[PDB]
C-alpha cells in the first residue's frame, strides 16, 4: 500500500549526511551509520507488511553465562516494536535463563551437540544455522540476524540493518588498508584472499539478511570449511575467514558500521562513532573456551 | 560469485562525495559520479543476463527527435548489455533506420495521437501500463521511461537499475520543498501540502522493474482520470502525479540531475561531474 502522510525534515541534496565517513559502497550498498537514516520512515515502511526478524545466538558450554544480559538488553534495544523470534542454540536447554519478553516476541531453544574444540564450536555455527534454515527459519521468520553471545546491546539496533544480505565492519580494521586485513593468506585454503583484493574486513560476530541469503551464506561457509578440513587446513580466523571470502565474492546489499560491533575497553568512544549499539562484554578467553 | 577483480579499496573514513547527499533518509542510494565502480556493477549485472527495456514516445512531430535519441542511446545507454527499445508512435513508417549494436533491438508500437500536448504527455502513463501487460512483463526485466526530445552525452548504465527509481529534476535539486512545483490544490489527486515532500522528481526519466513500473503508471493514470472527472488538471500533468506517487512509495534509488539536464537553461555547475542525458533545443 501507500505510506501515510508524515512530517519530517526535508533531505537536503547539497548537504552530505556524513562528512567524515563513507556512507555507500562502490556497489551502491548503504553503509549504515547514525545520521544516514530517518528511523520513522523506515519503521513505517517496515510495517507496510507483517515481517518477523529472527535472531540466532549460540550458548554452548560455559557461554550460557552470557545469555541473561544478551537477552535482557536485546529486549531493550533490538527491533523494538517489531515481531522478534529468538533462537538460542545450546547443549544445555535447562540453562537458558527465563527472560521476560515484550508482546510479539518469542524465544525458542534449539538443542545441539557441543564440540570439544572452541574452534569447532565457532565454525560449526555455519552448519547449524544452515541446517536450521531448512528445519525452521524459512517457515518462521523473514530475516535472520546472526550474532555472538558474548555481547550486549547498548543502543538502537533496528530495521535500518535489514536487507537481503549484510555484513558488519570489524571494529579493529575499519580504518585499515586491505593489506593489513587478517584475511586467510594461504592459497591452499578455500578462504584465501590475495593481498591486492578485499573491500572491507567483516566481523564474524554480526551478519545477516533474508533467510534465503543467510542459508546460502552459511551453507557455503560450511562447505568451504569441510573442504579445508579434508585438505588438512584450518583458516587463520576460522568462520570469520570464510565469511570474508564469501562476502568478497557475494557483495552485501548493506554494510553495517562499527557502531554495530564494538569493544569500548579496547577502542574507547571515537568521534566517528555517534552511537555504540552492540558491544563486547568482559570475559576470560582461556577459561571460558575450555573445560 | 564474482571473479577476482583488482580495483581501488573503498576508504571507510573518506566520503565518496563531500558536496552532495549520496543516500536518502530511507537508505536509497542517490546516484552521482563517484558513488559507484561501474566495473563491479557490470559484473554483477552481466551474471544475471539482464534485458533492459527503454520506452520513448514519438507522437506526431516528435518523430523528428528519434534519430539523435537512438544514435546517442547506442553510444551511451547500457552498452554491453541486452537492450530492447520500444518506440510508441502514430507514424510507424517515420521511425528512422538506426543500426544497432549486437544484443540490441527495437520494436515499434503503434498508438493513437492526442491533439493536446498535455494529453500526449499524460497518456504515456496509460500506454506504458497497458503494454506492461501486453509485452513488457514477458520481454524485459527493467523498464526505463524517458522523454524523446533528448540526447545521451555520457554514460547511463546499470548503476540506475533497481526496483523503482525517480530522477531529481534539474531545476529544483537545490530548492526547499515549499518552492517545489507540486500540485497544491487539495481538489487534485496529485495534491502535496507545503510541509511534505522529499524531492521534486522529473517526469522525463523514471523506471524500475516491470512490476513496479506497471504499478506506478497504472496508479498515475487512475489518479489523472479521477482528476478529469473532478474537472481539474494537475499543474504539471503526469509529472505532478509521478511526484505524488513517489512521495508515498519511496524509490529504491534516486538519480542525480547528471541524468536529466538542460545546459542551455542551467549551464554546467561544479557539482555536476558529468552531463549524461540532456535536453535538445
Ligand atoms: O506532440 C508530442 C508531445 C509530446 N510527446 C512526448 O511527450 C514527451 C513530453 O513532452 P515534452 O517533451 O514536450 O514536455 P517538456 O516540456 O519537455 O516536459 C518535460 O520537461 C518539463 C521540465 O522542463 C525542463 C526545465 C524546466 C524548468 C527549469 C529547468 C528545466 N530544465 O530541464 O533545465 C517537465 O519536467 C515535464 O514533466 C517533462 O516531461 C515528449 O518527450 C515526447 O516523448 C510527443 O511524442 N509528441
Ligand atoms: O565454547 C564456546 C565457544 C564459542 N561459542 C559461541 O561462538 C561464538 C564465538 O566465539 P567467541 O566469542 O569466544 O570468539 P571471538 O570472536 O570473540 O574471539 C561465541 O560468542 C558463542 O556464541 C560457544 O557458544 N561456546
Ligand atoms: Mn565473541
Ligand atoms: Mn521533453
CA distance to partner chain A, nearest, from residue B105 (Å) = 28
A132 near A222, Cβ under 8 Å?
A: no
A171 near A263, Cβ under 8 Å?
A: yes
Helix axes A118-132, A238-249, angle to 10 degrees: 40
CATH of the domain at B26: 3.90.550.10
Instruction: State how far the Cα of B219 lies from the Cα of B215, in Å rounded to an integer.
Output: 6
Spatial CA neighbour of B231 closest among B192, B181, B185, B184: B185
Helix axes A211-230, A118-132, angle to 10 degrees: 140
Instruction: State how far the Cα of A79 lies from the Cα of A88, in Å rounded to an integer.
Output: 17
Spatial CA neighbour of B96 closest among B84, B106, B111: B106
A136 near A49, Cβ under 8 Å?
A: no
A30 near A53, Cβ under 8 Å?
A: no
B21 near A37, Cβ under 8 Å?
A: no
Ligand 2 mean position, distance from CA A289 (Å): 8
Spatial CA neighbour of B169 closest among B258, B56, B80, B247: B258
Cα–Cα separations (whole angstroms), residue A51 to A54, A134, A214, B249, B261: 10, 19, 16, 18, 40
A16 near B23, Cβ under 8 Å?
A: no
Spatial CA neighbour of B168 closest among B233, B66, B242: B242
Q: Is the dihedral of CA A120, A123, A126, A129 positive or negative?
A: positive
Spatial CA neighbour of B26 closest among A14, A34, A38, A158: A38
Instruction: State how far the Cα of B160 lies from the Cα of A125, in Å rounded to an integer.
Output: 37
Cβ of B13 and A23 within 8 Å?
no
Long-range pairs, B224-229, Cβ under 8 A, ≥24: B224/B122, B224/B125, B224/B189, B226/B189, B227/B188, B227/B189, B227/B190
Counting ligand 1 atoms within 8 A of each CB, the residue from B121, B150, B264 with the most, and so the one to mutate, is B121
Instruction: State how far the Cα of A19 lies from the Cα of B32, in Å rounded to an integer.
Output: 16
Instruction: State how far the Cα of A46 lies from the Cα of A11, in Å rounded to an integer.
Output: 20
Spatial CA neighbour of B238 closest among B114, B141, B135: B114
In chain A, the DSSP E strands lie at 31-32, 52-58, 83-90, 105-111, 143-147, 151-153, 165-168, 206-210, 254-256, 278-280
- In this complex, the residue of A3, A13, A175 whose CB is nearest that of residue B248 is A3
| Pairing of the two strands A52-58 and A143-147 | parallel
Burial class (CB in 10 A: 0-12, 13-18, 19+), B154: middle
Instruction: State how far the Cα of A18 lies from the Cα of A242, in Å rounded to an integer.
Output: 31
With vertex at residue B89, the alpha carbon angle to CA B85 and CA B93, rounded to the nearest 5 degrees, is 95
With vertex at residue A140, the alpha carbon angle to CA A138 and CA A141, rounded to the nearest 5 degrees, is 80
B207 near B160, Cβ under 8 Å?
A: yes
Instruction: Give backbone dihedrals phi and psi of B218, rounded to 5 degrees, phi first.
Output: -55, -45
Number of domains in chain A: 1
Instruction: State how far the Cα of A209 lies from the Cα of A246, in Å rounded to an integer.
Output: 14
Query: Which of B5, B9, B248 to mutate: most A Cβ within 10 Å?
Result: B9
Cited resolution, angstroms: 1.7
B165 near B185, Cβ under 8 Å?
A: no
The SS3 call for residue A74 is helix
Q: How far is CA A25 from the centre of its chain?
A: 18
The order of strands in the sheet holding A105-111 is: A31-32, A254-256, A165-168, A206-210, A143-147, A52-58, A83-90, A105-111
DSSP annotation of A9 reads P
Cα–Cα separations (whole angstroms), residue B252 to B32, B132, B162, B164: 15, 20, 6, 5
Return the exposure string of B114-124: e unless at least 16 CB atoms fall within 10 Å of the residue's CB, then b: eeeeeebbbbb
Q: How many CB atoms lie within 10 A of CB A200?
A: 25
Helix axes B210-229, B124-131, angle to 10 degrees: 140
Residue partners of B1: CB distance under 8 A and separation at least 6: A249, A250
The SS3 call for residue A162 is coil
A41 neighbourhood in chain B, CB within 8 Å: 25-26, 250
A133 near A220, Cβ under 8 Å?
A: no
Q: Is the dihedral of CA B131, B136, B142, B144 positive or negative?
A: negative
DSSP annotation of A62 reads G
Beta bridge partners of A32: A256
Instruction: State how far the Cα of B65 lies from the Cα of A125, in Å rounded to an integer.
Output: 60
Cα–Cα separations (whole angstroms), residue A258 to A24, A164, A170: 14, 19, 6
> Which H, E and C letters describe chain B, residue by residue?
CCCCCCCCCCCCCCCCCCCCCCECCECCEEECCCCECHHHHHHHHHCCCCEEEEEEEECHHHHHHHHHHHHHHHHHECCCCEEEEEEEECCHHHCCCCCCCCCEEEEEEECCCCCCHHHHHHCHHHHHHHHHHHHHHHHCCEEEEECCCEEECCCECHHHCCCEEEEECCCCCCCCHHHCCCECCCCCCCECCCCCCCCCECCCEEEEEHHHHHHHHHHHHHHHHHHHHCCCCCCCCHHHHHHHHHHHCCCCEEECHHHCECHHHHCCCCCCCCCCEEECC
B16 neighbourhood in chain A, CB within 8 Å: 22-24, 26
Spatial CA neighbour of B27 closest among A206, A169, A9, A255: A255
Instruction: State how far the Cα of A15 lies from the Cα of B221, in Å rounded to an integer.
Output: 34
Cβ of A16 and B22 within 8 Å?
yes
A277 near A157, Cβ under 8 Å?
A: yes
Ligand 1 mean position, distance from CA B155 (Å): 22
DSSP annotation of A30 reads B
B1 neighbourhood in chain A, CB within 8 Å: 249-250
Instruction: State how far the Cα of B93 lies from the Cα of B47, in Å rounded to an integer.
Output: 37
From its phi and psi, is residue A42 left (phi > 0), alpha (psi between -120 and 50) or beta? Answer: alpha
DSSP annotation of A281 reads P
Counting ligand 1 atoms within 8 A of each CB, the residue from B54, B56, B60, B62 with the most, and so the one to mutate, is B62
Give the range of the structural domain holding residue B200, as residue numbers without chain letter: 1-281
Beta bridge partners of A144: A54, A209
Burial class (CB in 10 A: 0-12, 13-18, 19+), B176: exposed
> Which atom of ligand 2 has the smallest separation from the CA of A58?
22
Instruction: State how far the Cα of A210 lies from the Cα of B58, in Å rounded to an integer.
Output: 43
Amino acid at each position: 500500500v501507500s505510506l501515510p502522510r508524515m512530517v519530517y525534515p526535508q533531505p537536503k541534496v547539497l548537504t552530505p549526511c556524513r562528512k567524515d565517513v563513507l556512507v555507500v559502497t562502490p556497489w551502491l550498498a548503504p553503509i549504515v551509520w547514525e545520521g544516514t537514516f530517518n528511523i520513522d520512515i523506515l519503521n513505517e515502511q517496515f510495517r507496510l507488511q507483517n515481517t518477523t526478524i529472527g535472531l540466532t545466538v549460540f550458548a554452548i558450554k560455559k557461554y550460557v553465562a552470557f545469555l541473561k544480559l544478551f537477552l535482557e538488553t536485546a529486549e531493550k534495544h533490538f527491533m523494538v516494536g517489531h515481531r522478534v523470534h529468538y533462537y538460542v542454540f545450546t547443549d544445555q536447554p535447562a540453562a537458558v535463563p527465563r527472560v521476560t519478553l515484550g508482546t510479539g516476541r518469542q524465544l525458542s531453544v534449539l538443542e545441539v551437540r557441543a564440540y570439544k574444540r572452541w574452534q569447532d564450536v565457532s565454525m560449526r555455527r555455519m552448519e547449524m544455522i544452515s541446517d536450521f534454515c531448512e528445519r525452521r527459519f524459512l517457515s518462521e521468520v523473514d530475516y535472520l540476524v546472526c550474532v555472538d553471545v558474548d555481547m550486549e546491546f547498548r543502543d538502537h539496533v533496528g530495521v535500518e540493518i535489514l536487507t537481503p544480505l549484510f555484513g558488519t565492519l570489524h571494529p579493529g580494521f575499519y580504518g585499515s588498508s586491505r593489506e593489513a586485513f587478517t584475511y586467510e593468506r594461504r592459497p591452499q585454503s578455500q578462504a584465501y584472499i590475495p593481498k591486492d583484493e578485499g573491500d572491507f574486513y567483516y566481523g564474524g560476530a554480526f551478519f545477516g539478511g533474508s533467510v534465503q541469503e543467510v542459508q546460502r551464506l552459511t551453507r557455503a561457509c560450511h562447505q568451504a570449511m569441510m573442504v579445508d578440513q579434508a585438505n588438512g587446513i584450518e583458516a587463520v580466523w576460522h568462520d570469520e575467514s570464510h565469511l570474508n571470502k564469501y562476502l568478497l565474492r557475494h557483495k552485501p546489499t548493506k554494510v553495517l558500521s562499527p557502531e554495530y560491533l564494538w569493544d569500548q575497553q579496547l577502542l574507547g568512544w571515537p568521534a566517528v562513532l555517534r552511537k555504540l549499539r552492540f558491544t563486547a562484554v568482559p570475559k576470560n578467553h582461556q577459561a571460558v573456551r575450555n573445560p
